[PDB]
Amino acid sequence: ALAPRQVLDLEDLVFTQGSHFMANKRCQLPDGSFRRQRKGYEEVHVPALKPKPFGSEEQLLPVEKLPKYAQAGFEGFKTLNRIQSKLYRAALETDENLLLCAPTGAGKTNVALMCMLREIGKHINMDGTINVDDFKIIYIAPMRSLVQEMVGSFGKRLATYGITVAELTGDHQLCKEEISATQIIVCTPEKWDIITRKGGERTYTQLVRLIILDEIHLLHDDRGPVLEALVARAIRNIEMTQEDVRLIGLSATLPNYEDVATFLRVDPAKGLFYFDNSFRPVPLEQTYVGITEKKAIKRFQIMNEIVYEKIMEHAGKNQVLVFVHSRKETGKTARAIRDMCLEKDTLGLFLREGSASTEVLRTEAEQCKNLELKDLLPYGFAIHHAGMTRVDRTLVEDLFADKHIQVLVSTATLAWGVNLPAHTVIIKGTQVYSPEKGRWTELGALDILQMLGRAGRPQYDTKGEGILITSHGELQYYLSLLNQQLPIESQMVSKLPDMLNAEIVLGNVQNAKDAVNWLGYAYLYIRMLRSPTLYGISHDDLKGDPLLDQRRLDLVHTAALMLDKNNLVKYDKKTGNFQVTELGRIASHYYITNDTVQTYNQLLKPTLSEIELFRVFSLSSEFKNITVREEEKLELQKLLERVPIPVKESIEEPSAKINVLLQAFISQLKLEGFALMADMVYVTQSAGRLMRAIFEIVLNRGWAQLTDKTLNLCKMIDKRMWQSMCPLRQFRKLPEEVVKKIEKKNFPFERLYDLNHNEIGELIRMPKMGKTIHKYVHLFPKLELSVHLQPITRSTLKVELTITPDFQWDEKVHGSSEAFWILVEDVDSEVILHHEYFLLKAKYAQDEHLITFFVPVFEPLPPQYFIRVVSDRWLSCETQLPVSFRHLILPEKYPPPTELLDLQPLPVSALRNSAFESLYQDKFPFFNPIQTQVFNTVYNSDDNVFVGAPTGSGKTICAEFAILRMLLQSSEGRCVYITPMEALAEQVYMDWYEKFQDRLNKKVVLLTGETSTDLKLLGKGNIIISTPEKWDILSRRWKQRKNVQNINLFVVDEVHLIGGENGPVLEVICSRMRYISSQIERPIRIVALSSSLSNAKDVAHWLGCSATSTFNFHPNVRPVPLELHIQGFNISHTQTRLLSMAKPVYHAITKHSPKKPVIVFVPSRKQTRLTAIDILTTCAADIQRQRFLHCTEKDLIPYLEKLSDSTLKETLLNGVGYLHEGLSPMERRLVEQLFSSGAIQVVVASRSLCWGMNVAAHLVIIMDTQYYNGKIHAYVDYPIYDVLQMVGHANRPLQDDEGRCVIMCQGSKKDFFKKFLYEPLPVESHLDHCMHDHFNAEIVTKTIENKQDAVDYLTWTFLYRRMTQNPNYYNLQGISHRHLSDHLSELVEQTLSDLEQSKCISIEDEMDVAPLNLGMIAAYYYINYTTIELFSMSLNAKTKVRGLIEIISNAAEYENIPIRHHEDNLLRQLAQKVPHKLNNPKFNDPHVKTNLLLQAHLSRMQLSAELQSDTEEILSKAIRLIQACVDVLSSNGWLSPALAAMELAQMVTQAMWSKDSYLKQLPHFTSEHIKRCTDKGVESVFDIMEMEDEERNALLQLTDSQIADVARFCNRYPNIELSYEVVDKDSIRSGGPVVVLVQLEREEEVTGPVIAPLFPQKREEGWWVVIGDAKSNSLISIKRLTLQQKAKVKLDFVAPATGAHNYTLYFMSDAYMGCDQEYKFSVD
Ligand SMILES: N=C(N)NS(=O)(=O)c1ccc(N)cc1
């Protein structure tokens, strides 16, 4: 972006005066102007503008004529203004941008209220009052008092609608619970500026529909720029969001209004309104005076003379008000008026001619006041300023509204924050004091205009009188300010650098080019275009650049050079690109000037003292022109000794002045010099932001001591107290005296925790205060800290800090939340090696919290680290914990990785078989380096090999390599491929089916999970592939299963998932395969593919891999090089961090792959949709439009014509695809196909899909890297394996010479990612935590029998190898073999005891153990022992279907069922729809969630997509669990419970409740036809299949495809007749075996599987035969069977004594409802 540009002296082009850069050469005094000179005391008097007619339809509109709802806001008014009528039409009936130029006091408020009511009534419900969570309105006001007046009045007006208005302007910040529950935010421009330059501005700006800007003439003021800035951002955002917001502007009658109309994007014909002062609310006659020379006495006395004359002129029923510029001047005015009244015969008295009483009566009666109120109130006068109480201020205001107070002198605050008008207004002088300029200046425009607009009460005056007193040399200017002739200019050039940085930091300006465009968005651009001479531009240069390219480029270049000098931004001369500094980011977010940044960066140091800290604070360039006046030096010397910090920096120069003023603010020391008070206030209202800025600067750098100093200084400024004082001062309902008494005694605060209330009262000598002191002591926040550490590597330790609360919560004291900083410091407490922002919410305030993070350690290992948790707001609220590293081992360091040499790549010709080459020659001509190296050992050496290489580097085909010789050595061999994830298994199954059974014609299958079907598929396949669970349940019985023994090849992929959840299953199945290879004496070849592991040798020796077969490569030695970019976001609240990272993903796309494909991963599905849409709208804003679409819309139309999601159609035809599990697999494969084709450039995917997508990009972006766990009501970091898979998705060697990935994460995590992603990953076993189930399952198979071989088994585990090299990770404190064996024996003992207490095993002596019924059926159904124990203890003799479902939902396998954000609310909603209602339900409990899901499924209820996937996950194991329940119910002998359990099985199959019609089971059916049938006679499916064809088809009244789909279910319906015989019936007596034989016939053969559309897995008929006694509720015998036409069943059971033994024979199903039989019989 090279272009000619020259640096500029911005001082020449800036209007130095500001506020009043007089562009008006001469003010044309109106008609009726006379100038009576009196040598000073001149009177340039203009008349009141006479009224105007109502000619052109103009009329005061009746409030009843308004739209009916909007009449609520205008209640109390029976009409509205003329301006208000024209604007009623415009504003209430249109959404057009508006700009109202009207004189001061003309109304303004009510027209903005109409604009608000537009939006308020847009979101109406039919009978719901409003949609508060849908629209957010804001109101920008120039002064704080105006903000407060506005929020009060607007609340009063529109409370009827149910809206909530509030003020955000205050010294507090980062507190935003009110922004959530307030629909109309009133704020100052700089407030909204600091809010909307914060990252994640959308959190506030998302629901913004209406932006009002009151008193837009602020553009001329020095505060002008921020306004511009605001508008610019807003407008640009309404372009980037494509969500229109309405801009309302309110200005006074001043010129250049058309330019701000262009600025505000108002149509001059539709939204531009201008009213000259003939539309003034009360016609105003004004007089201006001048001063002759410098005579203070003369000035003040002449002011007083004018005041006395004009006040006396308005004696009765009139109020002549006076405005002063200081609180020392209102008292002086009262004094002077009273005195010169007295001096001249005390005349003017009895202004209220009812001297006896009237108003004097009420004044004296209400006289219980202070200061100068009690004397001037009966006299008739009054004063009003900020240094008064609320009661007395409101009392003066009331008695003035009562028109009983006559004269009132006040300051500008009354004119801004109170609706208090008067007949006459006298501006006493116009010189005010500015601490910013450090000098006396002239007043601002807004003050003068608001004050002189107060003249003339609205309904009580026919004419007003404004009187202004100033100097002569200013007259012509004030004449311009009050007669529509002072032009509005732009002060942007002086504020250009700062502003520019705020846009560089905000990411809205990445180059100088969009900087220039932004400058075009400003008011400065328009104002330069239409008056270039006063902006430094010639009329010829305007011809050269009509769009002013050169001037805007020069300006942004100067600002960028300034920001580069001060190091807020790095700016390169050539490309014109910007790069943000953390200095600049802090400067923007904390609203501080770049010179201050430079001073900080050159002065702040880790060894800085608190004295030097106060000095640096005083050197801020916000105070660079403050002066030490002689009139205050003695008071400064007095304050210096009364403050604690030395202030050695100087003597009595401005830095020492600032310092001592701040310390007098902290110490609450009173002052006397009024200029000194003004300067103090000006320093203190900024000191908070300045100190927070310094604190962030030092925190990010890790400097610990300065961090503590600075945070404490922030809190001392906030709470108005030093650290020497007692923290009890922070409770503001405590006395000052009592806390001073506590401080007098040298008893530290902490010991009050361990003290009686009576002993407290005795210590303080105040017994009555002791109870409340104890209360507040236990209300003070204190945290308990507990730590669990486990080494990960010699450089990194995993820490699990457990934060426990230890105080009473009070919403008044602590509010909705309490913030904390977690800090990890080294031994010297110098360097902060890690830190985090913790937040204790109010709801979970008493729950325990767990914080996992990682710290670094380097040898020589220090004795201990420190972990401090320090409150962000409370002083002396720190809890420290030393973590000792004295008994900590450092894990055995890993060796270097197997180097990949630069060897000639092997072409496909090395693979000699032509059919084998066929597949690999159609893709690539030669192999990549790592697979060229691994080829020798894998495909041609029958060695056990482990290859470790980054994800996506093409390691999969390496397995194929081995497989090749596999198929070469055996005809119909048996190889087993094991992958941890299911979706990866499905992808590799499709690929290898295409590669083998469809190409080589060798049967390749993937195990489905059902026992019989999977064991059948086992024998067929030459290649069987599976997940570790389906393979575990098959291989656990490797004695009876012959097929699992003759396995030529076992390949396990992604073995590094041993360390993740569901990892112990992989570990045990691999160890079992190794043990089988040992026993069979036929060495099963093992080949393992994994990521780059550090401890790859351990897993290599685990599987018998020689070092000639270990292939573990440094992750840098990828086939495709990768450029990783970790990018931190120091933002806590994740819902706002996502909105912040919004724009960075677009800028990352444009930076790292502007044309090439990208994948961006997000933590949700709604996030996939939203990210797709926001990328779309940003590309529309840039008008790139087709940047992400590389084909034609007509090319896609046929494809997208079959997609069901409308937004997916739109986003796809616009270039970007989204992949979320809320849509069909067909849509997923379609989007993947379009992406890999090149038509779709970018795809945004849910995290859950990072395993099952066969899609490669050039750039992989990751968002957030956190997801919400609602079981702990917090956010969890991603598993490292997921993000590593995502990163591996970035390397494709098809096209690119490089791979690019950027991860966007909270700062707390950044370091973490970096390290573990740049170097190999250490992995360990979690088998010791999930070991009991495998012992319970291998006692059943007799593989384990005693304790010694239970120890022998662990030798096969990876756990055995890892417990040695990393002891402390498994909490063993030794590395000798003694420690190993001791830990193993303790583990086996613990597991066996836990299993015995569960009634699953029996132990005898100390060796031999034996299975029990519970453990046998727990291993038979692959069910956890806890679930079986719970089943056995909970199932009672009389358990009904409701209790059946309850006990089912409590299973441990359903604890994995998660709880996500806002999901507790959805479960609350579902609780009232399900037929059975459980009391005392906790809605973050997975078990009540599963119960609700089961009740909704049985009731055939549709719900969310995530909840549907969860319902599928539960239904997968539902039948397993209910079969286990049937078995234990049989083993305990209860009859009707087991019958109800079989009923529950067949209920969960086809989603039928227990007592609904059986007709509900056939498909294509709703309740109306079952109502017709059951009312007319058809009650069962047998009635359906008994009817003739035509009478049924007529009874159906359905389509021809419906009858065809009904017939298939009516045919699959089992039709079985039973045959039962009691063998040797005549030969039966007591105690003898009784044998009942049962036989079954099925007319049709196995036509197909069980038909159940609402069940995900295709099941097969399972039947149950039962012998029961219906009276004893006794189940005698039972058998489950699988039926194929012919059956033969036997049931043997003993007999009791002779009696009426009437038995029942039950035939139950586990699938269908209504095909169950009950036959009574008798045997004696
Ligand atoms: N970045 C780290 N080390 N921690 S943080 O939670 O992300 C964080 C949060 C907020 C602020 N202001 C700074 C930092």
Descriptive notes:
The longest helix is centred in the middle third of the chain and has 28 residues, at 674-701. The radius of gyration is 42 Å and the shape is elongated. The termini are far apart. It is built from 61 helices and 50 strands. The protein is of the alpha/beta class and 1724 residues long. Strand 20 (783-793) and strand 21 (796-805) form a beta hairpin. Helix 27 (674-701) runs antiparallel to helix 28 (704-719), helix 55 crosses helix 56 and helix 56 packs antiparallel against helix 57 (1535-1550). Among the domains are: 10-20 and 491-585, Arc Repressor Mutant, subunit A (Orthogonal Bundle); 61-279, P-loop containing nucleotide triphosphate hydrolases (Rossmann fold); 284-482, P-loop containing nucleotide triphosphate hydrolases (Rossmann fold, 3-Layer(aba) Sandwich); 776-884, Immunoglobulin-like, CATH 2.60.40; 908-1112, Rossmann fold, CATH 3.40.50.300; 1122-1318, 3-Layer(aba) Sandwich (Rossmann fold), CATH 3.40.50.300. It has an 8-stranded mixed β-sheet with strand order 1-2-10-17-14-11-13-12, with helices on both faces. A 7-stranded parallel β-sheet has the order 5-6-4-7-8-3-9, with helices on both faces. The structure holds 1-(4-aminophenyl)sulfonylguanidine. 1-(4-aminophenyl)sulfonylguanidine binds at residues 696, 835-837, 1130, 1132, 1306-1308. Residues 1-1724 are annotated as: Interaction with C9orf78 and WBP4. Residues 89-272, 936-1111 form the Helicase ATP-binding domain. It catalyses: ATP + H2O = ADP + phosphate + H(+). A motif (DEVH box) lies at residues 1053-1056. GO terms for molecular function: ATP binding; ATP hydrolysis activity; helicase activity; identical protein binding; RNA binding; RNA helicase activity. It is classed as hydrolase.
